[PDB]
Amino acid sequence: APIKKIIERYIKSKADAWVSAAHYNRERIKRGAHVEKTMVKKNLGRLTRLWIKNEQERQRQIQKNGPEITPEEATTIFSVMVEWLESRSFSPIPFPPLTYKNDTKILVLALEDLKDVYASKVRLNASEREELALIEEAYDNPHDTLNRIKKYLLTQRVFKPVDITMMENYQNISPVYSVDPLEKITDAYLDQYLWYEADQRKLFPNWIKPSDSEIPPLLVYKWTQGINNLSEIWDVSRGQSAVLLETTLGEMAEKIDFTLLNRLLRLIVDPNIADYITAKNNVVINFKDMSHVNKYGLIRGLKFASFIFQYYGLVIDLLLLGQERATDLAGPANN
Amino acid sequence: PIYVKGGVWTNVEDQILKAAVQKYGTHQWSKVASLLQKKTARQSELRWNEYLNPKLNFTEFSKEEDAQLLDLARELPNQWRTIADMMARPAQVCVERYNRLLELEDEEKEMLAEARARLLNTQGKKATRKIRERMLEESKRIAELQKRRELKQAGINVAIKKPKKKYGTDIDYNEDIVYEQAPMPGIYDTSTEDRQIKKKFEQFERKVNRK
Amino acid sequence: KIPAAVSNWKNPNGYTVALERRVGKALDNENNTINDGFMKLSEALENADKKARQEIRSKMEL
Amino acid sequence: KVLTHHKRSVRATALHPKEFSVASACTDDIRSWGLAEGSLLTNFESEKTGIINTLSINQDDVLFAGGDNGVLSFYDYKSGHKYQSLATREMVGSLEGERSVLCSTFDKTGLRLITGEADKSIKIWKQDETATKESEPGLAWNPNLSAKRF
Amino acid sequence: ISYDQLAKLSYEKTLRNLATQKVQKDTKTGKITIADDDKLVNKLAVSLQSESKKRYEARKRQMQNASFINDKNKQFNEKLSRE
Amino acid sequence: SHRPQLEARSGAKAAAYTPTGIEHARLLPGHTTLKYRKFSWRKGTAFGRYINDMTKSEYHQEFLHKHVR
Amino acid sequence: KVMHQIRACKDLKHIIYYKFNKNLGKGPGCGFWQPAWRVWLNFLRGTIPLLERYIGNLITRQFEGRS
RNA sequence: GUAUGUCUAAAGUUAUGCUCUUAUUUACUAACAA
RNA sequence: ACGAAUCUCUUUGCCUUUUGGCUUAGAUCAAGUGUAGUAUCUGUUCUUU
Numbered sequence A: 001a002p003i004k005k006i007i008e009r010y011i012k013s014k015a016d017a018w019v020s021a022a023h024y025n026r027e028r029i030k031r032g033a034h035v036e037k038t039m040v041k042k043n044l045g046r047l048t049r050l051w052i053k054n055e056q057e058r059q060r061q062i063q064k065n066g067p068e069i070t071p072e073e074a075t076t077i078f079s080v081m082v083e084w085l086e087s088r089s090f091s092p093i094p095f096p097p098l099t100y101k102n103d104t105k106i107l108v109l110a111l112e113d114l115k116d117v118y119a120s121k122v123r124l125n126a127s128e129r130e131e132l133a134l135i136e137e138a139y140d141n142p143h144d145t146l147n148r149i150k151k152y153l154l155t156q157r158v159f160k161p162v163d164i165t166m167m168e169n170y171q172n173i174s175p176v177y178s179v180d181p182l183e184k185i186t187d188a189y190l191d192q193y194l195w196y197e198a199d200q201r202k203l204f205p206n207w208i209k210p211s212d213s214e215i216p217p218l219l220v221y222k223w224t225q226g227i228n229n230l231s232e233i234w235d236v237s238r239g240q241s242a243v244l245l246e247t248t249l250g251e252m253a254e255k256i257d258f259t260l261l262n263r264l265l266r267l268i269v270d271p272n273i274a275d276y277i278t279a280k281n282n283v284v285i286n287f288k289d290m291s292h293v294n295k296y297g298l299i300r301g302l303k304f305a306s307f308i309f310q311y312y313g314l315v316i317d318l319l320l321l322g323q324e325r326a327t328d329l330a331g332p333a334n335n
Numbered sequence B: 001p002i003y004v005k006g007g008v009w010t011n012v013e014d015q016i017l018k019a020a021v022q023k024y025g026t027h028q029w030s031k032v033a034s035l036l037q038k039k040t041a042r043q044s045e046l047r048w049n050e051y052l053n054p055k056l057n058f059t060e061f062s063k064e065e066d067a068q069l070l071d072l073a074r075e076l077p078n079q080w081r082t083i084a085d086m087m088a089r090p091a092q093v094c095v096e097r098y099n100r101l102l103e104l105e106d107e108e109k110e111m112l113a114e115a116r117a118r119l120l121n122t123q124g125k126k127a128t129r130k131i132r133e134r135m136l137e138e139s140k141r142i143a144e145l146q147k148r149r150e151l152k153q154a155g156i157n158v159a160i161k162k163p164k165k166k167y168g169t170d171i172d173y174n175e176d177i178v179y180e181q182a183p184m185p186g187i188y189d190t191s192t193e194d195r196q197i198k199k200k201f202e203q204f205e206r207k208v209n210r211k
Numbered sequence C: 001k002i003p004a005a006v007s008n009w010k011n012p013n014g015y016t017v018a019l020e021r022r023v024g025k026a027l028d029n030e031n032n033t034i035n036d037g038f039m040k041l042s043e044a045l046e047n048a049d050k051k052a053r054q055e056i057r058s059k060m061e062l
Numbered sequence D: 001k002v003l004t005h006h007k008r009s010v011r012a013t014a015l016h017p018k019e020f021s022v023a024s025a026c027t028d029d030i031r032s033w034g035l036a037e038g039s040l041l042t043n044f045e046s047e048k049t050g051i052i053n054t055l056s057i058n059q060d061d062v063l064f065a066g067g068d069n070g071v072l073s074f075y076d077y078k079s080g081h082k083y084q085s086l087a088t089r090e091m092v093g094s095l096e097g098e099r100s101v102l103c104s105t106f107d108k109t110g111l112r113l114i115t116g117e118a119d120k121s122i123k124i125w126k127q128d129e130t131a132t133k134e135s136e137p138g139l140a141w142n143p144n145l146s147a148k149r150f
Numbered sequence E: 001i002s003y004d005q006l007a008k009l010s011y012e013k014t015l016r017n018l019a020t021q022k023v024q025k026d027t028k029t030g031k032i033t034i035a036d037d038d039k040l041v042n043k044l045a046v047s048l049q050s051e052s053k054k055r056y057e058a059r060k061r062q063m064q065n066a067s068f069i070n071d072k073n074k075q076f077n078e079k080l081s082r083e
Numbered sequence F: 001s002h003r004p005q006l007e008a009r010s011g012a013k014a015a016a017y018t019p020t021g022i023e024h025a026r027l028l029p030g031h032t033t034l035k036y037r038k039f040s041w042r043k044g045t046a047f048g049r050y051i052n053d054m055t056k057s058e059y060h061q062e063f064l065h066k067h068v069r
Numbered sequence G: 001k002v003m004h005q006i007r008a009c010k011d012l013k014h015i016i017y018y019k020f021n022k023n024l025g026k027g028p029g030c031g032f033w034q035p036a037w038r039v040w041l042n043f044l045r046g047t048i049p050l051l052e053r054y055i056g057n058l059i060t061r062q063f064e065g066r067s
Numbered sequence H: 001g002u003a004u005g006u007c008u009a010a011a012g013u014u015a016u017g018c019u020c021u022u023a024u025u026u027a028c029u030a031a032c033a034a
Numbered sequence I: 001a002c003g004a005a006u007c008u009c010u011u012u013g014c015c016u017u018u019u020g021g022c023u024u025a026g027a028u029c030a031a032g033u034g035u036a037g038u039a040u041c042u043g044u045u046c047u048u049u
């Protein structure tokens, strides 16, 4: 025991030295100082490992003393979302059968998207190569591919673990999740299908920005126009006072509980899809020789994950606005 | 032929992987992958994690354990990695159990031979090269001796050339004593002993000469 | 008496060694304090859903 | 002259202020040495305490020794009498090996000990001005004799 | 067992191996010629060689007794297995 | 092959070594002299009304949050 | 660091010439080497210590081995 | 193709189950050709 | 039978050829041919044991 103690101490000292050094470096990098290319890569590595350690410690914490969400809160959320769809007459998205005229078309989109990664970079990794091969085969055997996908969705709730890395934007290093190609196709197709179905069924109300089919500057312009076109908005005569509130939903994806998320999805889509998606977020996150089961927290770097995030965003939006004001903003369900 | 990796785990292959893992450990998955001509790094590591690692278990679940499982399913919906961890089992197996509850050789031999060859060859090129040079050096030495000896037999005495000294202060240890750190000065007298040992030495030299 | 340290990372000499001695920890068991709350949560969801469902059917029948 | 009366790393030494001597530490034993002749002066009662990191002596013959155990020792420099043990505390988050006093020194006064511990803490120690021979005496000194150095 | 005990115990042994079967000083030179029996020193030499030889052959036997790759590893796994 | 440090290069040998008599940069006389001392609408919502661990510091978690996205 | 010296010389040339070529046209035929020469002298003054050290050490190494 | 590392570069120190024949693989290597 | 010596084995003790750093696991895992060599293959025949 004494030796174990001593070594624990000394690595804590060393660890302390490391972490602080890393922190110093990152501030240095932000400043834009003279720093070694090699040194910056080293710092990126250290900070990644540090991040992973932090993250999985948070997972442990979550496990060790229950979910952050109070069950009452969860219930309330459920009630809200239920109320919302009730008001909408929103028919849920089915599990996709062999019925579709669009099926092939949908598939073609996902493949195209995937191909977009590979058209530029001619020299490719092994994983990349595999993915490419899969894509090629899929083009060859569309119906068969579709069938395979369907089978996977029905069955597969344990996936290959997701490798990660950090792309180095020298302010803020960004995590890059790398799903194993076979599941990736599934993720793509599912995602595309979900978007087509969601937009077709009017899931996401107008007010959600990023997905609108309008350009971010265009979006901004539209917002400005809206602001102007409000009825007598600029008056300061009769004590009229406007306030604009920008804020960031901090860790909006990074603390989505799968249980709650699963149930939420089971509102909007066929439960099997929900089950799949929930099971996909629950992966083993390998990074550089350290792993952990991602027990609590959505992974942005799945293909469909965006949809999930958006759907979760809807919940938050509803909470903010309430049923009534949200209802107004959406308008009547029919028109 | 070069190609994209995958396929199915043949038992021999599995065994090889296990051996590799014993050798290189659970975080050098590239090397282990390389050892297997068919299977990838990622594939390999996954396999080890999922099926092959002995600190997993595939024993059936007790009724209590079944209850724990299905209760977990009820409570954690299809987060099977988490569920697996809770169980203390690997996840695929758990899922399968849950589901149940609810209701050529030349090539192989090539890689084997190569494998065994590798595992029994555990030195960087520096080492191999060094031993090679050592044996070569030895050979050279004996050849030189054979010449020298031959000449002696022939009647021409040739002194063996020194090692071409690498630096100015390079030492030959037969010239004179290495760094004669003498014994501690004599309390008890040592004179006769000195004589006897000297005689023994000289006698030994004589013997060698005669030998 | 310290055990001969063997790694999961780096053999210098390339000595193969037993798999138990290689990989360890063996402490995933916990499972108990982690669950306290999850039951309440998932149960809550189940009950909430039930309430919604019966409510929905009721209102529908109007 | 070369004193060698130590089994282990002699890794904490201190000059006495008004005596002209120097205490030294080993893994356990803490000799105190008279450096005029180059002679020993006094073995101490450090028989079970840890590896001594630092060993600052006070003005008033109050030899300090800092444990890798974490336990602050306190000796009468003249005799060797371990007149106080004090198991240190760590900061809330620390681990139990980290509470290790790695540095120490007294002021000019001798009424404030300062200790550089590995808990990233700089702990300081007063002598109790409320103390007497009946209110907190020493640790009832006893030379052990069990094949001992005294 | 400490090296304290193992010394005295080995001392006791070689005393059983014994149990089987003058000083002149020139103080100016400091040379303390202890003229002693030359036959006994020879008997020490032969006995001490024999003791070391017996031990030397003892390892040789134990080396020739028998999850590894090379000579060293086999022993290294044996160093792990003894625990 | 390539090995950890155990018995340091002890300045015994460097002492018995001969002088070089080179003039290094910093041994040029800097600071020659010494110093000395003296001596309605808000109702309708759903919800209407230190640690010594470098990996668990508030600063640290916050920092990580900042520098990841 | 001799760039400073070089730069100084350039500056001098620029100064000198345009006080030397007021009514006079362009061309190469100006002399007047004084201030530049001064610059170079001061550069040498600066460096004489540096070269005494540097070449000192150099020839020492040539003679005595390196430390 | 290199770092780099060895090698040579001449004068005589006075003592009495196998052998075989082949064809094929695979691997590695190759400033050799394509 | 006790004492001793010699030999062999077994139990323990001794580890007796018994892991000798650090970094971003230090980093990244391929698209080749024919010509030659080298080794390794496998067959292939016969000889005699």
Ligand SMILES: O=P(O)(O)O[C@H]1[C@H](OP(=O)(O)O)[C@@H](OP(=O)(O)O)[C@H](OP(=O)(O)O)[C@@H](OP(=O)(O)O)[C@H]1OP(=O)(O)O
Residues within 6 Å of the ligand: G010, G017, G026, G027, G028
């Ligand atoms: O300004 P610099 O790059 O140092 O070059 C100058 C400059 O030439 P540019 O103007 O073409 O650069 C001078 O030209 P003016 O400005 O005086 O017209 C010229 O001086 P002269 O006209 O007196 O010749 C002089 O040339 P020189 O060195 O022959 O005096 C020449 O310097 P470089 O020849 O070194 O470029």
